[PDB]
Design a protein around this nucleic acid. Structure first.
Lengths: 56, 123, 198, 73, 176, 36, 138
RNA sequence: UUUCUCUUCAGAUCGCAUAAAUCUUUCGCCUUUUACUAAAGAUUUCCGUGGAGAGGAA
RNA sequence: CUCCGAACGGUAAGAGCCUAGCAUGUAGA
């Protein structure tokens, strides 16, 4: 079934595999991806560009 | 249907605005209704006026337990709703009250090896 | 495969797990799925059938009871009218319904007890549960959840009906419940563990 | 008329008196009236045989004393 | 990891930082199919992308507790705990709808009642349509005014329990 | 009444024996050593 | 903080309203203040500062300025706005100004029960550092 | 004059009423126990209370 | 003729893979 390349493991299920890389030890070794709260202008650009691309 | 949406936006705004003022005056209306009932209780009529309904949320239309039918408690947790599921007259045999419980030899409360209680309202 | 019980009861527990030595309900589900597939392959064009589409059910779709997957999927030909959901024994069938291109079947084994003699009851119950529950793999809206009472030899079914299906599937279940190989194995195991050599 | 035991091993051994041909929504109303929890939050199970809010009571054919593992949503 | 936002959080004084939702429904959100995707991390920006791509406003459905991506994304923004400026920007967004709906919802669950009124009052004029999933799975077309009316006036407009916002009379007697 | 306790003791002994049999020649003991 | 007293206020109550309610608003703001930033008990310093300000004001009005009547000097404490035992502590010659207990010796409490500013100005504040765990009365 | 501290003695219905537990006996039960039922005797625990030093605010 | 009860005696044991809310606050150079 599902098999990871960097994690070096295999999960025999779907939901059980989905709960693996989201906080894996090897996933942590790949890099710390702690959610850094972006600036207030970040949401501004995320709104403007998405209104210009998806809508426009 | 933009012309219809703005027409209903006021239909909802009127009801929502009506609920606010109707809630404020209710505190005075409740006090005023007590004042109206105050004078009504004072000098309306000596047992010559009711102006009432004796309204109750859920009428417990009970019956008569046969001989030892268990005292079933409806549970007083939700009665303001006045749900129709409550009005069912819980005066029926549930599991073992279908029997007569008089043809039995002397008495049988429970042979479950736990008869701590002793009472049958004889006195 | 052993359905369930209450209390501990090691005696009847070991007796029941001895009554099902190997993965036996899996064998029953496979056998009856193939029996229904053959009964459908007997009259394919007469029922506007397109092809037998036996679904890749899970390896324990027969033991699980919370969900209800499609045993076999039936492709009708075209403009396939449908009757309203009813019972196998009900003759006054309502032919007023939609028209579906797919049509699922789900065999559910019911190891009933004394308080579970009603096979049609549990049948329609599991049917409406699997239909309204938004958690089961469920391609087609029209289908049937034909059940079977193993511990009482009862049979029942209720669901979306085909044109000319009711008597067809009625005779098919009458001929499948009787003369079934795995059913005969069940009877043999029971009579061996019960000491009623007749 | 039927007596049901909405039971649990967590301080809730409740005895609701359900109707014969009644639904389960009213049964949940009674279970809330006797248990003390919101109506839509209650859940009834018997080894993951989740009884639903539209399937009737006589459909599963419950009878006097059939206890049901109570759980919350 | 789904414990805190990054390293610290100004704990909402009502119940807790993350446990403003019932623990049962929270644990259900975790054990969910949608929690697999987008839970790798969403601080400020990708939340905007994941928000506008789900045109539902609803809570739980199904016999089992089935959380919508609306509710799960509300919980995601709750764990993220953005600043008030972004929430005010979403509250004043007229083009996208459900972004503004989520801004209103989080402001209701995360914010003083004064600011709740101050930022939710001008949402009393949108007579537009809103899609919502009933408990039985079936959808319903509901007006936004009805939504905010159930939010402020009524309790648990969604599966979540609300933290007892004051009556308007006391604040009218004391403040604006 | 004591027959229940006797059967429980017998079942516990049988379970311990089965666990020891599965662990002694286990995949981590026998089959794992089969590669060595 | 005005809730109720089951009777009318005295005659000279209208003069007290603005300053008293300003201090009460300061107290309400400090009560619902955030915890982030207060190290361990830093949140509990300004509440004592506000209470000290309120007692200072009502005491200056009581008989220091001789403005408040005798009813207000007991009715303002009869209802909850200041501390009577605290003012009685102020009546002493040594107890000039200090908090409840933040730099006191071993009083009835194991830490102290005398005052925050109870330490001396000539010998306390070891070396250069002046502080107090309970009120920070340097 | 009013209160808070405390070592101290109570056979006053210490409290114009009223809680539990432990032990020993007697019933009802009883599938094992813990939860039990209703009568007697005793020992403690809790809500307390009364009368006498000394020490602290008005 | 309204006195209404709860827990234990209960869910076989298993080898391969995987994910996590919690906890120390120091001695010393």
């Amino acid at each position: 079934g599902y098999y990871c390349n960097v994690c070096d493991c295999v999960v025999k299920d779907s939901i059980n595999f989905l709960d693996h890389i989201n906080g894996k030890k090897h996933q942590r070794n790949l890099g710390m991806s702690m959610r850094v709260e972006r600036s207030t202008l970040d949401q501004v650009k995320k709104r403007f560009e998405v209104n210009k691309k998806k809508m426009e | 249907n933009d012309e219809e949406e703005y027409e209903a936006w006021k239909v909802r705004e009127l009801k929502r605005i009506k609920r606010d003022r109707e809630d404020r005056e209710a505190l005075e209306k409740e006090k005023a209704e007590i004042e109206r009932m105050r004078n009504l209780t004072e000098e309306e009529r000596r047992a010559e006026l009711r102006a009432n309904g004796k309204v109750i949320t859920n009428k417990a239309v009970k019956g008569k337990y046969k001989f030892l039918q268990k005292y079933y408690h409806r549970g007083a947790f939700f009665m303001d709703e006045d749900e129709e599921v409550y009005k069912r007259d819980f005066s029926a045999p549930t599991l073992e009250d279908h029997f007569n419980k008089t043809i039995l030899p002397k008495v049988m409360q429970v042979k479950n090896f736990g008869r701590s209680g002793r009472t049958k309202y004889t006195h | 495969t052993g359905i369930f019980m209450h209390g501990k009861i090691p005696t009847l527990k070991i007796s029941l797990i001895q009554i099902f030595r190997a993965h036996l309900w899996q064998k029953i589900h496979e056998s009856i799925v193939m029996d229904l597939c053959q009964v459908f392959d007997q009259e394919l064009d007469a029922l506007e059938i397109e092809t037998v589409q036996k679904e890749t059910i899970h390896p324990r779709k027969s033991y699980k009871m919370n969900s209800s997957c499609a045993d076999i999927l039936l492709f009708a030909s075209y403009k396939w009218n449908v009757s309203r959901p009813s019972l196998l024994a009900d003759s006054k069938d309502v032919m007023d319904s939609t028209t579906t291109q797919k049509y699922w079947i789900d065999i559910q084994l019911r190891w009933g007890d004394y308080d579970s003699h009603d096979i049609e009851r549990y049948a329609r119950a599991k049917f409406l549960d699997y239909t309204t529950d938004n958690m089961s793999i469920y391609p087609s809206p029209t289908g049937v959840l034909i059940a079977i009472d193993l511990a009482y030899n009862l049979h029942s079914a209720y669901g979306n009906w085909f044109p000319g299906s009711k008597p067809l599937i009625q005779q098919a279940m009458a001929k499948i419940m009787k003369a079934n190989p795995a059913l005969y194995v069940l009877r043999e195991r029971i009579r061996k563990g019960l000491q009623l050599y007749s | 008329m039927i007596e049901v035991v909405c039971n649990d091993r967590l301080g809730k051994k409740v005895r609701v008196k359900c109707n014969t041909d009644d639904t389960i929504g009213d049964l949940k109303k009674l279970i809330a009236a006797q248990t003390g929890t919101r109506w839509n939050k209650i859940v009834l199970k018997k080894w993951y045989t989740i009884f639903k809010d539209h399937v009737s009571l006589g459909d599963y054919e419950i009878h006097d004393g059939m206890n049901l593992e109570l759980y919350y949503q | 990891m789904a414990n805190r936002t990054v390293k610290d959080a100004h704990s909402i004084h009502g119940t807790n930082p993350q446990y403003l939702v019932e623990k049962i429904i929270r644990t259900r959100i975790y054990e969910s199919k949608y929690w697999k995707e987008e839970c790798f991390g969403l601080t400020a920006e990708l939340v905007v992308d994941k928000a506008m791509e789900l045109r539902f406003v609803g809570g739980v459905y199904g016999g089992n507790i089935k959380p919508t991506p609306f509710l799960c994304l509300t919980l995601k923004m709750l764990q993220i705990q953005p600043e008030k400026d972004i929430i005010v920007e979403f509250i004043k967004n007229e083009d996208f709808k459900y972004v503004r709906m989520l801004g209103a919802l989080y402001m209701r669950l995360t914010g003083t009642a004064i600011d709740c009124y101050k930022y939710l009052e001008p949402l009393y004029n949108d007579y537009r349509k809103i899609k919502s999933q009933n408990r039985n799975g079936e959808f319903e077309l509901m007006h936004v005014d009805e939504f905010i009316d159930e939010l402020l006036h009524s309790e648990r407009v969604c599966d979540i329990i609300l933290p007892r916002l004051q009556k308007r009379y006391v604040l009218e007697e004391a403040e604006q | 009444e004591a027959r229940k306790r006797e059967l429980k003791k017998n079942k516990k002994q049988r379970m311990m024996v089965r666990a020891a049999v599965l662990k002694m020649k286990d995949p981590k003991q026998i089959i794992r050593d089969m590669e060595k | 903080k005005v809730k109720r007293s089951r009777k009318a206020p005295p005659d000279g109550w209208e003069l007290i309203e603005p300053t008293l309610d300003e201090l009460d608003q300061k107290m309400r703001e400090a009560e619902t203040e955030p915890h982030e930033g207060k190290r361990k008990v830093e949140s509990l310093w300004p509440i004592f500062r506000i209470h000290h300000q309120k007692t200072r004001y009502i005491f200056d009005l009581f008989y220091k300025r001789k403005a408040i009547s005798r009813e207000l000097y007991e009715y303002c404490i009869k209802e909850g706005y200041a501390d009577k035992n605290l003012i009685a502590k102020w009546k002493k010659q040594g107890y000039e100004n200090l908090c409840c207990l933040r730099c006191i010796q071993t009083r009835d409490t194991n830490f102290g029960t005398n005052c925050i500013c109870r330490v001396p100005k000539s010998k306390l504040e070891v070396g250069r550092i002046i502080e107090c765990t309970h009120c920070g009365c340097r």
